[PDB]
């Protein structure tokens, strides 16, 4: 029996074109450039899931560095202080204290100064 | 309510018809007709008949007031192309598209 190409090709290409929604011009209309755009969007998204974790740790560190310099510590001294003090609060949490309750952050920086 | 008129499959490339239809879109029908009368294009007399048909339809089928009518919509859609050939140099034949237009005009009371 003969099997004509019917429906499966259209169904597969239309899914890919839909994943390219929002892309500039031909990249959201045409299967061939849509398919490349979607492949590349996934590649970037895989890479950026690793880069996002690095990005946020750099943002926290910058904010802790700021909050610690208002206490006459640098980030390098404060984090050394906390390690010696035994405090295990991570950078995402310190960065949040350094924005939301600076009183608490100053208490931790006090503990740090004491350990040094 | 609003009145429609369409001239389907007019020999007149859509681009050439759109450049004129763009002048009337949203005007009062009185003014629109004057714009078509003093716009010296091949599209002008064709678009005028569609627009005057729309106004007749609006006056006879829907008893609307022809003194209070604005062109609500006016657009040109591509009709089926007549495919032709022009013999060029070196025995070669280059394609000619004798394009057609669907001219739609919609008048609305306000």
């Amino acid at each position: 029996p003969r099997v004509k190409g019917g429906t499966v090709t259209r169904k597969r290409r239309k899914k890919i074109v839909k994943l390219a929604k929002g892309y500039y011009g031909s990249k959201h209309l045409l299967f061939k450039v849509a398919n490349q755009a979607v492949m590349k969007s996934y590649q970037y998204a895989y890479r950026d899931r690793r880069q996002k974790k690095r990005d946020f740790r750099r943002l926290w560190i910058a904010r802790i560095n700021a909050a610690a310099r208002m206490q006459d510590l640098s980030y390098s001294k404060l984090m050394h202080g906390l390690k010696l003090a035994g405090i295990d609060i991570n950078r995402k949490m310190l960065a949040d204290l350094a924005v939301n309750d600076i009183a608490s952050f100053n208490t931790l920086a006090d503990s740090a100064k004491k350990a040094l | 309510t609003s009145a429609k008129a369409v001239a389907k499959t007019v020999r007149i490339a859509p681009r050439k018809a759109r450049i004129v239809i763009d002048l009337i879109r949203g005007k009062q029908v009185g003014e629109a007709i004057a714009i078509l009368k003093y716009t010296p294009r091949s599209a002008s007399p064709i678009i005028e008949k569609v627009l005057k048909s729309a106004i007749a339809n609006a006056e006879h089928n829907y008893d609307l007031d022809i003194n209070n009518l604005v062109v609500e919509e006016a657009f040109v859609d591509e009709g089926p192309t007549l495919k032709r050939f022009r013999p060029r140099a070196q025995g070669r034949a280059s394609a000619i598209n004798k394009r057609t237009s669907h001219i739609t005009v919609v008048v609305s009371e306000v």
Binding site: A62, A66, A95 | -
Partner: protein
């Protein structure tokens, strides 16, 4: 998730007046670039502009260590053939000190649209006087 992100206008941009008298051109510049980018605030958000306005006064007295006054050359190209002009840092400190500090600091700001906004927050003066008294600027120490 939960990391704070400054919104435009949220963080209070303050006005600082910095006396440049006898500080290395860099050394002055690197500190100011930090104040402009708002790197000294825990509210620092890399995509916003949480930084302060900076007025530099006495830029004619900025310091140039070694032979930089005669040997540090600032280049401009018009984009016409052979259209390369040069000025010495010393000549430029004497005549266009405003321009010397602006060049110096413009190189230590991010090279993007936000970096171009930051540079608009910098006000350099050859002498000791500015006309920004209305912004009630606070003295800042390096």
């Amino acid at each position: 998730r939960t990391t704070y992100m400054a919104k435009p206008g949220e963080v209070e941009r303050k006005w600082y007046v910095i006396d440049a008298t006898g500080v290395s051109l860099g050394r002055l510049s690197s500190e100011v670039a930090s104040i402009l980018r708002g790197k000294n605030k825990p509210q620092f958000t890399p995509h916003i502009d949480t930084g302060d306005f900076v007025i530099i006064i006495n830029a004619g007295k900025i310091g140039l260590t070694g032979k930089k006054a005669t040997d540090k050359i600032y280049y401009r190209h018009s984009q016409y053939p052979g259209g390369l002009k040069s000025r010495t840092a010393g000549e430029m400190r004497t005549n266009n000190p405003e321009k010397l500090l602006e060049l110096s600091i413009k190189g230590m700001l991010p090279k993007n649209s936000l970096g171009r906004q930051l540079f608009k927050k910098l006000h350099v003066y050859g002498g000791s006087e500015h006309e920004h008294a209305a912004q009630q600027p606070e003295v800042y120490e390096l």
